[PDB]
Design a protein around this ligand. Structure first.
Ligand SMILES: *[C@@H]1O[C@H](CO)[C@@H](O[C@@H]2O[C@H](CO)[C@@H](O[C@H]3O[C@H](CO)[C@@H](O)[C@H](O)[C@@H]3O)[C@H](O)[C@H]2NC(C)=O)[C@H](O)[C@H]1NC(C)=O
Ligand SMILES: *[C@@H]1O[C@H](CO)[C@@H](O[C@@H]2O[C@H](CO)[C@@H](O)[C@H](O)[C@H]2NC(C)=O)[C@H](O)[C@H]1NC(C)=O
Ligand code: NAG
Ligand code: NAG
Ligand code: NAG
Ligand code: NAG
Ligand code: NAG
Ligand code: NAG
Ligand code: NAG
Length: 871
């Protein structure tokens, strides 16, 4: 069953056969950054197991021109092979003239060439702007999951590990980096230089990497002698300082924490200009977006600092979770991505406790629950096959839900027993691969009535959705049922092994009960006012207090809120508003709970609460529901006047202090509070008049620019300043500010530039569209554009890239009318070209219907509740 030139093709599965295992790759690459193409050769030391007529391996968009097979027994230098190509599985078959012999080592050699990548995949070209306005080319790799094969032919599944010796030829004006450090640089006849790189460790193909560029570094050494260097564009070297400092502290932490040294002499962190993902964990050569790594204190803010620290810690943790211990197959991608996200917490809490990152980790878990509460959610670990359905595994479920469900398990086993379990996991499967079950046996065993942790996690990993815990308190006995939590019912299948954590009014001691059933009972050792299940919200479930249970907790908040823990509070605020969407509580209960927030000073809770009230304002503003929006404006500005007026247009104070400032000054300026608009307007006007000279504090930088962008003069100068900027973070904030214009031609212009890709890089287009679509003046525009340019979009990105998923989601999911639901339905059916299908078509439809339902069921309550206040 087969093509191309002619005949049958030996192997039919899209997975490779087990029979021939690579041990080592010699790989020579000769890129040309004027021609924008490359020539290359490799030699794959392979080991046969079963006898065979055909070697099979991956290759894509590669012209193969010579293919020889040598041996050491057998047939010494050396015989030629025939190449069959089968693009539909991205495979090529090497036909041999002789049934190869078991247990012997051969050498597969091919010459191959291709144009440098045109997109964000395989070995591609990126560009950057010099301070002088020069444009400069570099070449870079991104192979995850399956684009190693676009750069050199190989056994491109992450189970087929091997050693890699890379050689790279280059002009004198460039450097070459790769996974390993550079052993030597030999000069050649014609003036060109060639760099030789230490042979790698055993590793998967998706992590192999190499770059050619004219970047400058800053370097440092960890206590363990590792040479960390931070590579970036030449005129951006000042911005590499924080990343160096942090990575140093972080690698020290990770080394000790895991009790496993980082194996390589060096670890490079490079800031690539055209970079689709946030970062990529390429062993010893970690590639990052400039916003994931660079930092300029004149222009990056607290949040940016927190983000850069977070991604650095994420990618450094990958060096152990992923690279050192790789998953067997892409179905279990979370073992890498989830653990890496979890370790951000542990590592950043340890190295940078001033950042208060653990309060922010709750945020990330809650934002998961929001998407995980629909029918069309999926498990963190489900099977995967085709080139599309592997790319579908890359999102936030396999990632954040992963990290939260791990964070739960830390709490249930304690930091010390959890740590010891992953130390053994890492050591037991070092330089090797591991399944889901291999992790659980490692965490249970660390005699003997059993931790049977497998059973507990089978239900959190391989099963969809999230539990709701309902509790009734009749005097001194507690009723406990569990249900699947959905966002529209009145579920017939599911059941979790959910550890529980309750506290009471009587004492603040944490008692623990587990559970492995639909129903259960537990009596408390006291009569008491309230119970609060899920302490600090370290579990990944939602609590509903049926009977008077909710009302007690709200009267507790209004009386003396500090008798609940500050994380206990954010949990309750969250849960209440979600249960309104569930139809288990009524909106007035939720809105009444927001009264205490004029006394709340824990910014976690205060920001959470405000986010719901701001969320409602924006729902109302996008629909033209003026009477409610104008009331909700007025409520937010009068209630919360004290805390708004207490805010300095400054960079002063803690991290949460600075984030609260940015939030509240944004809210005030988004709701047209004349004092905040006039201050912002002054700061911008002084700035533009001085021509970049004055300094807007970084925490009000978005606010000042966005207000400034309402005048035509300001918008045009901001777009100009965008192109000249040397901070990708300032640029980010400028792009937001530009996308808050009311002028339709201006919003379109931004989209057109983002298509064009020269001034506003294409990597920013999805976020840009979503920025526009969020607002009432651009929600239609953005929608029209995405439909009318679907073909035009799908040249620039493949579906289902993260980029395409966020273009669909970001232009549609905020809709909340029956009309627009139909428009989206229509458009989604229309895409039964190859288009249909993606999982995100369903989840958008369910998201829009959720908004339809929420409005019909709760809007008149929101209207009256606001009118009750005004009296
Ligand atoms: C990728 O392709 C480039 C051309 O597109 C090539 O640049 C060229 O390099 C040669 C020397 O290496 C220059 O020619 C020189 O040599 C001849 C004698 O053989 C002399 O007649 C000339 O005076 C000169 O000394 C070309 O001038 C040069 N082209 C330019 C404009 O720079 C790159 O070297 C290739 N890159 C790699 C790394 O493969
Ligand atoms: C491929 O990588 C492996 C490690 O994954 C290398 O094996 C190391 O070899 C040295 C010298 O024999 C030993 O001291 C180490 O114990 C090995 N590493 C570990 C930690 O197991 C091997 O050198 C590489 N192979 C090639 C072809 O160079
Ligand atoms: C190779 O050998 C073993 C027998 O030892 C067999 O089980 C395995 O299937 C063989 N590989 C194939 C697919 O021919
Ligand atoms: C394949 O191309 C190489 C280029 O290095 C050449 O030396 C060789 O002669 C070619 N193969 C054969 C069998 O001629
Ligand atoms: C950063 O500033 C220092 C001193 O002010 C200067 O020497 C250097 O050129 C600057 N670096 C960059 C990349 O702008
Ligand atoms: C946060 O960090 C400190 C150590 O710096 C520790 O006392 C505390 O237990 C940590 N919490 C978590 C979630 O690890
Ligand atoms: C959830 O919703 C619809 C209708 O109830 C159902 O057909 C669908 O299969 C469910 N979601 C998925 C993708 O399982
Ligand atoms: C709230 O309760 C705390 C703890 O007893 C107490 O210190 C404080 O004075 C109380 N304040 C109010 C507002 O009742
Ligand atoms: C939307 O806003 C416009 C401008 O204020 C207003 O004229 C119109 O009444 C609103 N649309 C509807 C149908 O309410």
């Amino acid at each position: 069953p087969v093509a191309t030139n002619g005949e049958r093709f030996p192997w039919q599965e899209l997975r490779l056969p087990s029979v021939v295992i690579p041990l080592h790759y010699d790989l020579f690459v000769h890129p040309n950054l004027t021609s924008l193409d490359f020539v290359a050769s490799e030699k794959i030391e392979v080991l046969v197991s079963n006898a065979t007529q055909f070697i099979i391996l991956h290759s894509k968009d590669l012209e193969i021109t010579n293919a020889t097979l040598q041996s050491e027994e057998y047939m010494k230098p050396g015989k030629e092979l025939k190449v069959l190509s089968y693009p539909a599985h991205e495979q090529i078959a090497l036909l041999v003239p002789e049934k190869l012999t078991p247990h012997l080592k051969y050498y597969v050699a091919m010459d191959f060439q291709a144009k440098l990548g045109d997109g964000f995949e395989g070995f591609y070209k990126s560009t950057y702007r010099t301070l002088g306005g020069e444009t400069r080319i570099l070449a870079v790799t991104d192979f995850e999951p399956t684009q190693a094969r676009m750069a050199f032919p190989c056994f491109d599944e992450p189970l087929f590990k091997a050693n890699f010796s890379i050689k790279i030829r280059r002009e004198s004006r460039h450097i070459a980096l790769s996974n390993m450090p550079k052993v030597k640089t030999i000069e050649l006849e014609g003036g060109l230089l060639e760099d030789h790189f230490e042979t790698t460790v055993k590793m998967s193909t998706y992590l192999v990497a190499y770059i050619v560029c004219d970047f400058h570094s800053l370097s440092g050494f960890t206590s363990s002698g590792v040479k960390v260097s931070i590579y970036a564009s030449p005129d951006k070297r000042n911005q590499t300082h924080y990343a160096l400092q942090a990575s140093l502290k972080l690698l020290d932490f990770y080394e000790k924490y895991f009790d496993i040294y980082y194996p390589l002499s060096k670890l490079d962190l490079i800031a690539i200009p055209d970079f689709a993902p946030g970062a990529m964990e390429n062993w010893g050569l970690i590639t990052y977006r400039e916003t994931s790594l660079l930092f300029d204190p004149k222009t990056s803010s607290a949040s940016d600092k927190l983000w850069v620290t977070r991604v650095i810690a994420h990618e450094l943790a990958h060096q152990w979770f992923g690279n050192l211990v790789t998953m067997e197959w892409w179905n279990d991608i979370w073992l890498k991505e989830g653990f890496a996200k979890y370790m951000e917490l542990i590592a950043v809490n340890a190295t940078y406790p001033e950042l208060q990152f653990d309060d922010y980790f709750l945020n990330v878990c809650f934002e998961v629950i929001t998407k995980d509460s629909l029918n069309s959610s999926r498990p963190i670990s489900k099977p995967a096959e085709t080139p599309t359905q592997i790319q579908e595994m890359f999102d936030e479920v396999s990632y954040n839900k992963g990290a939260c469900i791990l964070n739960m398990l830390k709490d249930f086993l304690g930091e010390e027993k959890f740590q010891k379990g992953i130390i053994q996991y890492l050591k037991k499967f070092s330089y090797r691969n591991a399944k889901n079950d291999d992790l659980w046996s490692s965490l249970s065993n660390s005699l003997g009535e059993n931790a049977e942790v497998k059973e507990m996690m089978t239900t959190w990993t391989l099963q969809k959705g999230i539990p709701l815990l309902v509790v009734k308190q009749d005097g001194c006995s507690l009723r406990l049922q569990q249900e699947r939590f959905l966002q529209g019912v009145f579920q017939e299948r599911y059941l979790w092994h959910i550890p529980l954590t309750y506290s009471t009014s009587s004492s603040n001691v944490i008692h623990r009960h587990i559970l492995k059933s639909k129903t259960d009972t537990l009596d408390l050792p006291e009569k008491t006012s309230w119970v609060k299940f899920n302490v600090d919200s370290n579990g990944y479930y939602i609590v509903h207090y049926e009977g008077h249970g909710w009302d007690q907790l709200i009267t507790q908040l209004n009386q003396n809120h500090t008798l609940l823990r500050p994380k206990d509070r954010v949990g309750l605020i969250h849960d209440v508003f979600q249960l309104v969407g569930a139809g288990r509580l009524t909106l007035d209960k939720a809105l009444d709970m927001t009264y205490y927030l004029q006394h709340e000073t824990s910014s976690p809770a205060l920001l959470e609460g405000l986010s719901y009230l701001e969320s409602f304002y924006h729902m109302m503003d996008r629909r033209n529901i003026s009477d409610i929006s104008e009331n909700l404006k007025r409520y937010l500005l009068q209630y919360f006047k004290p805390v708004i007026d207490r805010q300095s247009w400054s960079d002063k104070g803690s991290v949460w202090d600075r984030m609260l400032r940015s939030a509240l000054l944004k809210l005030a300026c988004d709701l047209n509070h004349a004092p905040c608009i006039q201050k912002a307007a002054e700061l911008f006007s002084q700035w533009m008049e001085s021509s970049g000279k004055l300094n807007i504090p970084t925490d009000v930088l978005k606010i000042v620019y966005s207000v400034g962008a309402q005048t035509t003069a300001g918008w045009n100068y901001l777009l100009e300043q965008y192109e000249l900027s040397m901070s990708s973070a300032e640029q980010n904030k400028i792009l937001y500010a530009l996308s808050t214009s009311k002028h339709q031609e201006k919003l379109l212009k931004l989209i057109e530039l983002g298509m064009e890709g020269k001034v506003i890089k294409t990597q920013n287009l999805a976020a840009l569209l979503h920025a526009i679509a969020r607002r009432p003046k651009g929600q239609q525009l953005a929608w029209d554009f995405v439909r009318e340019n679907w073909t035009h979009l799908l040249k620039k990105f493949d579906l289902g890239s993260y980029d395409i998923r966020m273009i669909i989601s970001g232009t549609t999911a905020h809709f909340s009318s029956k009309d627009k639901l139909q428009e989206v339905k229509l458009f989604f059916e229309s895409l039964e070209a190859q288009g249909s299908h993606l999982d995100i078509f369903q989840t958008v439809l369910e998201t829009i219907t959720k908004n339809i339902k929420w409005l019909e069921k709760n809007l008149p309550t929101l209207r009256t509740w606001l009118m009750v206040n005004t009296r």
